[PDB]
Amino acid sequence: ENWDDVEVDDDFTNELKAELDRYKREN
Amino acid sequence: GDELTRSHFNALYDTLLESNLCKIIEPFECVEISHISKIIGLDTQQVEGKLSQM
Amino acid sequence: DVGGLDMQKQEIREAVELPLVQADLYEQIGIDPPRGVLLYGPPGTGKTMLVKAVANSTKAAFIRVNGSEFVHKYLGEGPRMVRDV
Amino acid sequence: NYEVSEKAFLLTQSKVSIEQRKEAAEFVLAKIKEEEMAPYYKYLCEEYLVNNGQSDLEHDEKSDSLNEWIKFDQELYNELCKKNESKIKELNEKIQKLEEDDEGELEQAQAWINLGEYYAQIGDKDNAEKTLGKSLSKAISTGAKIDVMLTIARLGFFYNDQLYVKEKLEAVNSMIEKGGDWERRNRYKTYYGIHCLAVRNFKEAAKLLVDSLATFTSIELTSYESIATYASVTGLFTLERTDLKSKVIDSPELLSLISTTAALQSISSLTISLYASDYASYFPYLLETYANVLIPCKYLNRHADFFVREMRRKVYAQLLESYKTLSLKSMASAFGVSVAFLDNDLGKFIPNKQLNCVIDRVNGIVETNRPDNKNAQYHLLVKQGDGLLTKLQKYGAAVR
Amino acid sequence: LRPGRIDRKIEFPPPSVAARAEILRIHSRKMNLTRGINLRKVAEKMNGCSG
Questions:
Q1: Are the CB atoms for D247 and D211 separated by under 8 Å?
Q2: In what order do the strands lie in the sheet with D365-368?
Q3: Does C26 lie at the interface with D, CB-CB under 8 angstroms?
């Protein structure tokens, strides 16, 4: 396999929890 | 009064609601969402949630 | 119009009417359906009641040939009429 | 031997819950000592090479594992060789009696059946396959022939053999007549479903995994909770919303799993959030499932984050058909999505034609494109037709 | 009965619970089954049954 089947993203992995944190704080 | 048959009418609440929407969608598309909630007598967010389910 | 045979009627409808509708049910359960159904018991009572009900309910191709009807006055005509059915 | 391969994979790369490595390392040390396998204690050195969370401490001080010594030694190796030489002496004593007797083809094959189990339990792979080929031809029926495939599938799941195991898998299936045989059906659908995993077929994976005969549960290779684990993952692709409310949510086999195993939670948090199409609840259950499902499983963590991209693609299509024009800040305060990071999330699909979403950067609203038409469907025939004409010209000019 | 005709006489005992346990799984092996059943429990309810 190739394209995004291997490299995928390699970003915003552990930062997904920060999205819910900034929503419950800055609110 | 019967608790055994009560579970059936509780499931028909969503079934008859989708069946009642068939009478509302009779003039095909291009109908107002707020006009639908006035006929069925439910909240706007309640109607928009059921329309997206069908 | 015929009661009391529901015990033997259910067995025939599953071995006759059922495989003619859905033939994939026997392949999933791994059971070979019988190629036909015989009938026994004291003569002169039943065996014409259940077959007549299937012909009316199915409304499909039905072949009724007497047992001794296959015998023809000519020698070779007998076996030829058997394969033709 | 399900926990043997499971705990060995947990020590390879684990980025979440490092405490599971302790129960995994203490299990593989006590399992090898209680078994006859010599080399599987030595394979820990080569298999963990170049991996995050190293389990071996010799020249590499970066090991994050709790048990840092897998090192191979001659103390345990010599003890395992004594049990191997003592057992083969008892088998060869019985085989020598069988060779002098030669009663039927079952006893002649049973000599190689005891070896097929022996060479598999002493750590031999190619040497075990040579012994299984002799018992296959001497079998009196298909009952002893499928037991040969069971040992082939055992050594094939540990070493990930997609060639020799797959060829012998369909060989027992075809033979002369298949029939409704339980052994040639239940075992085939489960093993072939495992082979579809690694290659990610998804066409037969939903039918042969989400739908299982009863429990499977042979306990030798894979377990009960493992079959239901891949069913929740593979059931989110091929199976549409029609089958999610039948063979997934209302499936009777998955009703008792909630009250039994609470460490999965992939049949509830993922299924309810997708059936209700609520992105607010669906988002936090992605990382909770990714940690306790994709990472520990051997056939999942090899891909991992790619599944997160594919699973999120499903929920984006659920909302896209629920509206035409919508503001970006509406789903932000409701479904809990960041507006600044929303363009980057949808930027991996829309330019690849995976989604019809269209966001207006002026007023900050999202639109909906045409989901299907005649033009987009004929494009598949163009790539399929041009790819087929290549073989006709290649094979046509090759033969002359 | 006298020798010179039948040199071996084998007496067949009737099937039992342990005997029908291995017989039940062979005939059912050609069809669909469920792992939630029991092999020796079904044969326990049957008594004096033939093959």
A1: yes
A2: D326-327, D365-368, D357-360
A3: no
